[PDB]
């Protein structure tokens, strides 16, 4: 999981 | 749930050109990255469906892969080496922005880019 | 006039619709984003929200002053975050589209 400036999404790792 | 259409590989409105630098970017630079063991996730466009990543194309709006770069070079899509290099930078940048530092996909992209920079350093003089 | 309206309805509106624009559309809320040292480091905050409000409220004297605020926003990101960071790469994509629009002023 990655967070940038409040926005969060699933990475390829998860 | 669905993958977007892939980036274009030819354009009648875009001026075509073939230079020794663009020949080197196909025969030497791209061939080296393509044959690398860490190249398989970068050969086709990111398949967000098979990877179960519904957010990938909600974040990345200008995708790029080596298969697109390969077809563009074979179709003389680029006018000069900078435009081709810019697609390489987009491919790496997308991976760094979407994934965490230290992920497998990022370690793999970092290794490819280092070899990419190794060949770009010896890009031939345009004749 | 013609150069200030071009930066409001073309330049600012293009960058606002860009994919990597959401961190820069508003001032950095360091309390919400949990960045206690942001405003200790950034002494001249700038964002696309305030630049928008300065163009549509007649705050600039010429197009050169508006370019400064855009560079200040890009700089404050290149100052606070490590080179090659994801957020830094996002700011470099906006600046490249910015320098391409200013080149056709
Ligand atoms: N993942």
Residue numbers in the entry:
A (entry chain C): 1 to 14
B (entry chain A): 42 to 168
C (entry chain B): 60 to 164
The authors write:
Within this class of proteins, the bromodomain and extraterminal domain (BET) family contains four members that are transcriptional coregulators and that recognize acetyllysines (AcKs) using a tandem pair of highly homologous bromodomains (BDs). Despite heavy academic and industry investment in this area, the generation of paralog-selective inhibitors has proved elusive because of the extremely high sequence similarity between the bromodomains of family members (90 to 95% within the acetyllysine-binding pocket residues). Using the highly conserved BET BDs as a model system, we conducted three mRNA display-based RaPID (random nonstandard peptides integrated discovery) screens using a single library (which contains >1012 unique members). Crystal structures of 13 distinct peptide–bromodomain complexes revealed highly diverse structures and binding modes among the cyclic peptide ligands.
To assess the contributions made by each AcK to BD binding, we synthesized peptides in which each of these three residues was mutated in turn to Ala. Mutation of AcK12 to Ala resulted in a complete loss of binding to any BD1 domain under our assay conditions, indicating that this more canonical AcK–pocket interaction provides the largest contribution to binding.
